[PDB]
UniProtKB/TrEMBL annotation, chain A:
Protein family (similarity comment): Belongs to the complex I 30 kDa subunit family.
The entry's keywords: NAD, Translocase, Transport, Ubiquinone
Any Gene Ontology CC annotation: respiratory chain complex I
Protein's UniProt name: NADH dehydrogenase [ubiquinone] iron-sulfur protein 3, mitochondrial
Gene name tied to this protein: NDUFS3
One GO molecular-function entry: NADH dehydrogenase activity
Parent sequence residues shown: 43 to 250 of 264
Domain NADH:ubiquinone oxidoreductase 30kDa subunit per the UniProt entry, residue ranges: 46-165
UniProt key word NAD: yes
Biological-process GO terms, alphabetical: mitochondrial electron transport, NADH to ubiquinone; mitochondrial respiratory chain complex I assembly; reactive oxygen species metabolic process
Reaction equations catalysed: a ubiquinone + NADH + 5 H(+)(in) = a ubiquinol + NAD(+) + 4 H(+)(out)
Function: Core subunit of the mitochondrial membrane respiratory chain NADH dehydrogenase (Complex I) which catalyzes electron transfer from NADH through the respiratory chain, using ubiquinone as an electron acceptor. Essential for the catalytic activity and assembly of complex I.
Compartment(s) where it occurs, according to its Swiss-Prot or TrEMBL record: Mitochondrion
Subunit architecture: Core subunit of respiratory chain NADH dehydrogenase (Complex I) which is composed of 45 different subunits. Interacts with NDUFAF3. Interacts with RAB5IF. Found in subcomplexes containing subunits NDUFS2, MT-ND1 and NDUFA13.
TrEMBL record, chain B:
Entry's family note: Belongs to the complex I NDUFS4 subunit family.
Compartment(s) where it occurs, according to its Swiss-Prot or TrEMBL record: Mitochondrion inner membrane
Protein name as annotated: NADH dehydrogenase [ubiquinone] iron-sulfur protein 4, mitochondrial
Function: Accessory subunit of the mitochondrial membrane respiratory chain NADH dehydrogenase (Complex I), that is believed not to be involved in catalysis. Complex I functions in the transfer of electrons from NADH to the respiratory chain. The immediate electron acceptor for the enzyme is believed to be ubiquinone.
Classification lineage: Eukaryota, Metazoa, Chordata, Craniata, Vertebrata
Subunit structure: This is a component of the iron-sulfur (IP) fragment of the enzyme.
Gene Ontology cellular-component terms listed: mitochondrial inner membrane
Keyword Oxidoreductase set for record: no
Keyword annotations: Electron transport, Membrane, Mitochondrion, Mitochondrion inner membrane, Respiratory chain, Transit peptide, Transport
Membrane topology field: Peripheral membrane protein
Superkingdom of the source species: Eukaryota
Automatic annotation (TrEMBL), chain F:
Catalytic reactions of this protein: a ubiquinone + NADH + 5 H(+)(in) = a ubiquinol + NAD(+) + 4 H(+)(out)
GO BP annotations, alphabetical order: ATP synthesis coupled electron transport; mitochondrial respiratory chain complex I assembly
Organism: Sus scrofa
Encoding gene, per UniProt annotation: NDUFS1
Family: Belongs to the complex I 75 kDa subunit family.
Residues of the full protein shown: 259 to 718 of 727
Protein name, entry field: NADH-ubiquinone oxidoreductase 75 kDa subunit, mitochondrial
Domain of life: Eukaryota
Membrane topology: Peripheral membrane protein
TrEMBL record, chain G:
Function: Accessory subunit of the mitochondrial membrane respiratory chain NADH dehydrogenase (Complex I), that is believed not to be involved in catalysis. Complex I functions in the transfer of electrons from NADH to the respiratory chain. The immediate electron acceptor for the enzyme is believed to be ubiquinone.
Topology within the bilayer: Peripheral membrane protein
Superkingdom of origin: Eukaryota
Keywords: Electron transport, Membrane, Metal-binding, Mitochondrion, Mitochondrion inner membrane, Respiratory chain, Transit peptide, Transport, Zinc
Whole-protein residues included: 28 to 123 of 123
Protein family (similarity comment): Belongs to the complex I NDUFS6 subunit family.
Origin species: Sus scrofa
GO CC terms of this entry: mitochondrial inner membrane; respiratory chain complex I
Subunit relationships: Mammalian complex I is composed of 45 different subunits. This is a component of the iron-sulfur (IP) fragment of the enzyme.
Phylogenetic placement of the source organism: Eukaryota, Metazoa, Chordata, Craniata, Vertebrata
Protein's name in the database: NADH dehydrogenase [ubiquinone] iron-sulfur protein 6, mitochondrial
Main location group: mitochondrion
Positions that bind Zn(2+): C59, H68, C84, C87
Cellular compartments annotated: Mitochondrion inner membrane
Boundaries of every Zinc finger CHCC-type domain copy: 55-91
Amino acid sequence: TRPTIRPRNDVVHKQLSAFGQYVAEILPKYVQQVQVSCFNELEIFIHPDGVIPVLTFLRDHTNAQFKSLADLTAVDVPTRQNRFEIVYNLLSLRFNSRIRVKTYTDELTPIESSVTVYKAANWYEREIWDMFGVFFANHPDLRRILTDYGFEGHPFRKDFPLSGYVELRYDDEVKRVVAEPVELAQEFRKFDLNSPWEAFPAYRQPPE
Amino acid sequence: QLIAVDEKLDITTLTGVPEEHIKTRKVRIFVPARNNMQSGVNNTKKWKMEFDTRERWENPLMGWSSTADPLSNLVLTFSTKEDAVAFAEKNGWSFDVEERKVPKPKSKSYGANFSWNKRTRVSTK
Amino acid sequence: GTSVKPIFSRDMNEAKRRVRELYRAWYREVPNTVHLFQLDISVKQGRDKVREMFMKNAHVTDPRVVDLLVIKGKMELEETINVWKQRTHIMRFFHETEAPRPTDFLSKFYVGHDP
Amino acid sequence: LGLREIRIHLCQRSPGSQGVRDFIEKRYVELKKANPDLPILIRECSDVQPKLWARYAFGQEKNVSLNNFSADQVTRTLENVLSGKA
Amino acid sequence: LHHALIPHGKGGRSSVSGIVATVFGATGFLGRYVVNHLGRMGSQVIVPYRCEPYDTMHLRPMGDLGQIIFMEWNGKDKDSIRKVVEHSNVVINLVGREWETKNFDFEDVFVKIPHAIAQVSKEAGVEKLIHISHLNADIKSPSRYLRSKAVGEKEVRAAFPEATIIKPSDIFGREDRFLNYFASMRLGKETVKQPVYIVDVSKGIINAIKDPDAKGKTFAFVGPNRYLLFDLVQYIFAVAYRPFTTRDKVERVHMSDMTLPHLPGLEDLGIQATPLELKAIEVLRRHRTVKPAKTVN
Amino acid sequence: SNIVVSTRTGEVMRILPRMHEDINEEWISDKTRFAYDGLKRQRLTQPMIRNEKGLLTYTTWEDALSRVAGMLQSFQGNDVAAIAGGLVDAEALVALKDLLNRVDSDSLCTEEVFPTAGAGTDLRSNYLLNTTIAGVEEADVILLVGTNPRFEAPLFNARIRKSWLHNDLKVALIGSPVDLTYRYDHLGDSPKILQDIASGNHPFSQILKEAKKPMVVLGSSALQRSDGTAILAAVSNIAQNIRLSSGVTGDWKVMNILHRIASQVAALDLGYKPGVEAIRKNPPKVLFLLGADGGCITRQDLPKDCFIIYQGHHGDVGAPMADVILPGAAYTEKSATYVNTEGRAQQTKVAVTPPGLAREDWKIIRALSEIAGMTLPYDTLDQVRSRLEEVSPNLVRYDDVEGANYFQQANELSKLVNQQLLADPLVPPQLTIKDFYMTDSISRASQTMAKCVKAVTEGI
Amino acid sequence: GVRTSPTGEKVTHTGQAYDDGDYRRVRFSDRQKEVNENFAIDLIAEQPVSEVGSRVISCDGGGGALGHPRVYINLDKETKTGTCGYCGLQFRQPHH
Ligand SMILES: NC(=O)C1=CN([C@@H]2O[C@H](COP(=O)(O)OP(=O)(O)OC[C@H]3O[C@@H](n4cnc5c(N)ncnc54)[C@H](OP(=O)(O)O)[C@@H]3O)[C@@H](O)[C@H]2O)C=CC1
Ligand SMILES: [Zn+2]
């Protein structure tokens, strides 16, 4: 491992693995998986019903005190029965550590709002609802935050087209801005960049 | 605490897609064929969903290529054919599914290149 | 089988009741919207547009979808009442600039290749 | 009233088409002997009922079902179609 | 049909409609609506102007990139007319002044300029010509306006036999001189008026362009209802919430609108005429700070 | 053969092979690969009508369709007829058949001739490659009669070459001694040789008797020579002798017919009369040319002032003789069904859209029917495919090749007429490679094919 | 080496020119059509053929790292000259 390769830290790896097993032992009702990545990032995969308990634990336990919510977001994977995965990034200042909590939902299953655990979640949840269509139960005021008023659809979904469905212009007959079906003078050029000849043998999937 | 409803899933009214881009389109679910210019097979592993090709015309200024259908560049990736069928069905798109084409196993023998009495004997190597 | 978590309604009747409440609220609001935005439409055609937008989703037989639609309609009503929308957003429901599209087979044959 | 062509859509393996298949392999030739100018098309269904299509003048068509019919029954149906009797 | 002129797209902003239109008098009231209608479906528009380009700036966003081309012209010269209409397949004449100027009287505006436009367009092989005259244009009119309108209509027909003549009554719209003029006064009972909406006239011109059978025809664009002048002005003042151009305009506004049943109208072009009661508020709301007038049918 | 069309910004750039182990494995023909150049030349873009001078001039869809519909209403019965060319899809074929049936016309013809005596097209296996392309790898003897598979069906010949190389396949040929890129046993040029093999005098009868998986392949080019009935009867007699002497080995399906054009099998499935003889017997006064460019019918074979409509995509020998031109779509510009020589139905996909005012062919026929007061029941492509299922339900199974065997019935019906053979050696039309490049209207418009013809005629 | 159309328009080095029936010509009225006067094909046609006493020559377009990728050109064929695939320069062996 000469100067072009990123150095690795075994002590942090061991510490994060130990804390992951600790968390899993404490909350076996909700934890389904624990992982530590090769660049020393710990993630915990939980059942959706445990969003409020688990987070509360990680915020209030003396051995965790993850008091900061760094980020809350969603990822859309159409091939899964539960389309959306919800990712919470937490920072602990007492122990100078970071953790990630993942759960899942589909287009019709509500997720509990975590504003009672972290005040920062409020706008984040709004953003998720705006961009993916995930509903959060018991949210103080859930509504659109990024899209235009009356905008239809959720643009961060994979099946949503890049340029959308409508475009805006000014019309002098009705003397106002109007929305019309989108027409592009130059269509966006789709590129097929992926090569054959797989790059990484370590991630090869079984040929099933 | 559980409704226990029994019905086919349909989220068409919630996706914001215009009416004529639901019941007029035809999606194709298929494993893409290997590019014959190359030998690698890594691009023939996953299932693709792609929409039907619509009109493309020439821009009167600059002669660019113009389109009016918003789904001309939309391609979705799926692990199995069943996942793609489920997605298309719940999204209200009529689909055509093509079965995966697999190269059949072949009998290869270097020794057959130099045959006593068969036609497989090569004239050069 | 196929047990699922509710959003708001345990069955179809509760969803229908929520739909009726939302429709009542929109019907009450329409004249205020017409006056306050200084629109050029009548109250009658505003309420007709509300009815049409409700009837567009009349084929749904799933309570979760129905009350998600009700949540979205309540969001739209809250946007309208608080005058967060402009006149352009309100007028977008009517497509007064879009050219009419013929549903006839011959007309679509004549105009282009689109079915 | 003028017959133009008839169509027999039978399936390869399903038992319901069995008798229909028999009719062909037993009697179709003789039928083609009696009607050398009538197109009797034989085509293949798949997981569908056996059927008989009859086309008359000006493009009018009538179809009848042949599910579980025996060779005698399909022969009688075909004679009824050819003669025009109801 | 010259492949570069074959329609393509969905009839939108970046579509191709196959129309190359030269619109004379595009900088006025009717011209802005005509150019907007032409450019929203992706036609190519050539705008001749004699005014400052600043006065033509409001037509720039009316079309896609390259679809609106501004060229300078003057009505006394035939070369500018020729270079403006060289490449068009349809020419529209909207040129007209409602008063007399020291450099252009009614004869030049309504007779000589339309005649020159028609002759040059016929020489250049323009396929379609559309000319606007007045509904009450007759040879024996007491007013020089309508008299010159009738003479110009005859000369346009002589120069361009396949020309389409569109005759309209007082046009009421947001930038008109009917409703705004009647609202700026701050006699009747014998004059009858038949006003027509501006958008109706624009759609009529567009459909006349698109109609293949409207080649040599003459149209009359009129509204649905006929009003007496006194009650019409009463309605105008009521809509504004307020208590109740040298010589030619007075004589033209005191005269009654003629009735020509034998001429095709907006309904022959597939247009339903919009009543004044639906647009009076739109036009007259800016004059502020339900009881519609009686009609004669 | 399965292909991939490469497009960019609405233009076809190239054609590549698409892998299908059963049809073309991994290869395509030079014509298939390089003839796409012809899609950019001599294209029909707008409707056309005859002016007062007699010259073809542009017009709208309304005018051309109204002129065609007026004559369709004026004439009926046997006064109306249609000819189908070699690049026509099944949707347009069934649409035209329905339109002509609604006027009580049954003269739906193709340019390629198949003998109608006996079973005719009533039994599908009577006009198919029953062994299938892959089944050649299982045969041990093959007999080629009156065909040049090298240029008529290059991938079928490649499969024969592969079986010859790897399976020690024995090959014999009846016809002219062409070069097939493999060594074969020339039995001669006379059709009477078949009779000898049918009788048992020829020693190749003993060769075929000993075979476990024998194969007899007869080309349609040998069926066009007015001996088609007698040639087909002789081949059927040979196959019946094989099955009678060697017994029933299984479902081996000895008999085979090798076709040349892509539209023939679908037309025969749908009930089109093969050949153009019905036109000669009863000349029509309204004639539909659905991409027909073989020139087998001239204005001399039709009465004076016959109304001829050409629908197609290229300007070729078929367009200048027509009164009305309706511009259609090429195979790269529509989703259309074609059935190959095996009886396997496959659909194309839209790569680009038709140029100018050209439209989908079945849509043209449907619009014409509506304008003429004879509206067809179907309005979408799905409904047209439902109609195809109603008429012949094998046209909607899009990769299936298996079918019933009615060889016994066809062989028994083929013994009724006793047409004699001609004293004329079997000479295939594709004698040498210079005759392979130009065979259809797309090939004839290709500049690359012209370069190939020039290079093979004189080389540097 | 610019040419002129039968109408009067200049023909570009790509051969572009609107035909007589094209309406798009209207974009140039009261304006100009931008045409580059130096045609690269004619300019590269005027370069002399270089003479080298080797079977294989190398070309990088001149200027070292400021040129193009370095390529090697075979000069065994006496019928024609070797041409660089980037630069267009020509090389030949000293025939006679
Ligand atoms: N009451 C109505 O509005 C109806 C209109 N009429 C006719 O309809 C036509 C258009 O109506 P409208 O839009 O309201 O009239 P406008 O006064 O609004 O504009 C007329 C156009 O003609 C141009 N124009 C006027 N004089 C000259 C000239 N001497 N040389 C060159 N161009 C000139 C003007 O351009 P610029 O500003 O640069 O001078 C202007 O763009 C006119 O011919 C009118 O007579 C038909 C029935 C009534
Ligand atoms: Zn160089």
